[model samples]
Target chain A: GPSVFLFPPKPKDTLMISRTPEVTCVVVDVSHEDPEVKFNWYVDGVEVHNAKTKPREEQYNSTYRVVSVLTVLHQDWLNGKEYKCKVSNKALPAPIEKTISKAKGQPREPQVYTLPPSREEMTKNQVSLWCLVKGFYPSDIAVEWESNGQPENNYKTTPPVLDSDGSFFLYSKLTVDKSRWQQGNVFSCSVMHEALHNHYTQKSLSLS
Target chain B: GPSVFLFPPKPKDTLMISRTPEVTCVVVDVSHEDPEVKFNWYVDGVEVHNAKTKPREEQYNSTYRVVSVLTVLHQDWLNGKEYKCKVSNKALPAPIEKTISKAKGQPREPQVYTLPPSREEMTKNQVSLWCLVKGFYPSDIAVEWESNGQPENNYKTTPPVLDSDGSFFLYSKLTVDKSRWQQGNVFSCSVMHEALHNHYTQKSLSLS
Candidate 1:
């Protein structure tokens, strides 16, 4: 078991804060006679230059508390931003950081479509299965292919492209010999997206 | 670039299988007089012993076909088993392998609990925090410690012990200075399990 060192705590009333959508506040404590404690505020890892700190007030015997507030652009906050409060004192081995997040990240569900080869192309003794996934936010995704209930490892997928609507889209191709059309074999394309976690999307095809 | 070769198509009636569940069938093609082709069945990665391959039939001119079936125990198939069909012939440079899965492996979620130091120990000017993780599978887990959102490098985790139920449980300890308790600093424990992808579980503690 290791011990954790903490600075003194401020009164609960002083910590209670109201938000004006773009404004936030934090409080820190130091000794009444000591001035070694330092406070810093950051937005998404970048230090804030305009943060304002108020004069320390006596909170308890020999202890004083100070409050700092930073105002941000409401548009930026809604567009996804991070707020962090960092504190450091000479007695600490590393600075302590506390993150405050007011903005919720946006998520858009993905759409999956499977395209089978045209009969003209199938007649050439080959077939291609194309899967298109579109209208999703955040690029991370997983895709897999199966034929007649059997998983297939051979396939090609293009990197995601940023769309005009602030979303993303990608496509994959699985080619198999035309023997599948003649045999009436079934092929399926499955996709997993961050926006949807409960069940994956699956599109099945068979020369039709 | 297109087309996956499915073994010669079989009659639609026989394909409609009843899950006596143990019996599975796969069909392949070989010349009527050509005994050059071979078919093998496997469970997981090892070849099966009870796989039965029957004589060929005249499905087309000079084109003969063969059927192979394998019977497995009903319980084994339900226990996350892998069924594979491997086909090899002289003309093909590599053998074609097909995997069949009827069961989706179930992953047990890890349960995390962070234990803060007792007041008796804190009064001695030290603290040892313990994190208990229970009911998880596949023993590969990573435990990370953080103080006030900042990561701490020093920590220790014990090897997992298999629980009574086929699951696993483990614990980790993060030691820090008692100054944290005095300042009301927050400590957090995060766990990443092998059974889970793209996410982790976290538990936090604070004295005040």
Candidate 2:
């Protein structure tokens, strides 16, 4: 009944992380359905060590030592640099990638969508859409559906599927009442993960 | 000012540890410093291996898992037949240790104490007597002036000292009050600790 966030919804953009320091912290809004929500931070596509992966009961209560403390130095390094904030949960069921983590860049070898990249905009009642995540591995990939540079008023239902080659294919859909979508919301699809599919040795695709 | 337990004044005294299943949990009470607190559990009188020592903030109206949800089910081989629970602030300084844990009947080493043995009883308005406590560590030891199987009321102007042997010898002087001292006051020193040193080593000394 609860949802997870992978990052702030924005359009196709690139982040340059080697510039300045960063004090980056991510806030995860959890729900009663999602008990024990943890927030894990990442830099350079790796979960920060001692990084907090649990939802703080207090919005900014520093109840932990290393992870919960503000990584001011790391944030300073990430100042103005491109950093991705991925949010996930551990209270979900199977067929779902609850074991997935966050990172700095795009997924390694994403499967190419054969569909016409078709999207439908709602006109009368509520609007909804879904995408087939066709390539990846370990089933721990990040998926997001947004409109424009912001999150499209929508929600995800089904998880992705893993192929025999050890890669993964997932789906993320968006749905909104006609009245809400009419208020103005652009939709976009975002797939975030590692670069080399470091999870397993299976052959992964390459993206230029 | 002295610090108070925001959570459990003391850890759970008895723990039900089954060797068949390893169980770890933290119990906390209420504190004034913060609304939400974190608990950490230890096994065999030893701090839990690689237990996270960071601060975690649980939002208001939320409970945190200072104790992990992982279960150990080998009740037969459980070393001490119990465990310990500790509460701390990952973001704050060292947390308060409640020194209570484990169930009944697990084999554990005993802690012994040696105190100057002497008895004394006096009326009011008499000069107070004292025993000097030297160096101490792993602070599980305490010193008090007791009367008639009860502790006497008085405050020490100076702090106790620790001896090189990793033990502390605190000197508590007898009360100078008249009727209060004659109320069959019996001064005693004690060291309250867990299975490791759960001995109430006391010396019923008197005023010269």
Candidate 3:
């Protein structure tokens, strides 16, 4: 049975910061239960000697899971430090590497896109709207859709989508009755993310 | 200080079947350490009984980290089965509930889109093409762009974007020299997912 692996599975980067002054990064690697597999961590281009390693072996399943953690001070992280984790195993063509860094402070606005309903969907009296919030960080964010000053429910939200530059993007979809679409009503999607200070990023669209 | 949580974090769903046809679904919840917080699990519409529970607490600096795991068996998971885990704490506005079910077997073809570069990018001699692989499942997939029947490399791939239905979407970008655009190139984004058989789902675009 083949197993699916996550974490550093995609060719993307993510950012993390601790509340006060300490940051911790953890990475895991799983492979067939072979003793040759090894994991390592590095900070600021220097091999980390104090990284904590936990390795688990599943005998019946013939799989090995290993996790490595590295903790660093906030001041050290903010000094343009680079953190990397490498996993070595014969199964891999090369050492798998993942990196995380202190996030940049610049905030990019969300890009909203509208997708009109297909004729079949319109015939069924349904309208779907999407709001894409992109290039933002500090993933704690709230999104809502409102029509006529009333909040809408049952909207679908995607998890924070990671970017190569340690930024994130999210997409939310709101579906409504097509009769409401023909009535020319104003609908808006509002976003509240850590990047913004109290004010929400809102966008509105109407279909006739 | 605050601690990050992983759950439901890995945008992944896995299934394990024991030799006796027993299926145990395990869900883990992690959050900031707070003695007042509570965790609960449910199978179908009824509260879970015979549910094995394990709670671990750790304190470091000013933050507390707690991990709670709930495991339930196959019989309960198959009959009107909807598995949900709820966490309640004062820090949250309301109980945060996450639900996972036997993923519905719906194979949605990837809705691919090509985003051409803007005029500014053209002036920079860069043509960036984006293939939005939307609404597909079973996460193991390969996406590449082909020019004149040859595969292209150096494309950037985002992590599997999680959808509410357990399906996923991903985006890959292929950037080429604008000089290649003037040479009448044929570019196609090809996708290989489990939903499709040996045949690939491919879409092609030509730049004039």
In model 1, what lDDT does residue B109 have? 75
Proportion of native contacts kept per candidate:
0.00, 0.00, 0.00
- Least accurate 10 contiguous residues by lDDT in model 2 chain B: B1-10
What tens digits encode model 3's per-residue C-alpha lDDT throughout A1-208?
A: 1112122221111122323332232222344544455657677778878766644433222444344556565456546577776767666667666565554566554444333444446677577876656556644456778888898763656666554456666667788888887788888888765455443567787763
**For all candidates, what are the clash counts?**
28, 85, 1
* Ranking, DockQ, top scorer first: 1, 3, 2
lDDT of 1 by residue, A8-119 (tens): 1111111223323333343334544554556777788898888766665453234444546676664455455677767666556687665544324487887775655643
TM-score of model number 2: 0.24
Model 2's chain A TM-score stands at 0.37
DockQ of 1: 0.02
Q: Output the worst ten-in-a-row residue range by lDDT, candidate 3 chain A.
A: A5-14
DockQ of each: 0.02, 0.01, 0.02
Q: Of the candidates numbered 1 and 2, which has the greater TM-score value?
A: 1
Q: For residues B1-208, write the lDDT of model 3, one tens digit per residue.
A: 1212212222212222331222222222233454455667676757765544344333322333344555544454434267666666666667766565544566555555554554446787678876666567655456778899887754655555554456676677787888887677878888766466543678776654
- Which CAPRI category fits model 3? incorrect
| Tens digit per residue, CA lDDT, model 1, B1-208 | 0011222111111122433334333333444454455777778888887877655444423554444666655456446577777766655567766555442445677766565565447676567887777667654456778887688644645545555466666567777788876788888887776455444667787774
Q: Name the top lDDT candidate.
A: 1
> Compared with the true structure, what per-residue lDDT tens digits does model 2 show for residues B107-178?
332232222221233332554644333333333234445556655544231222223343433334444465
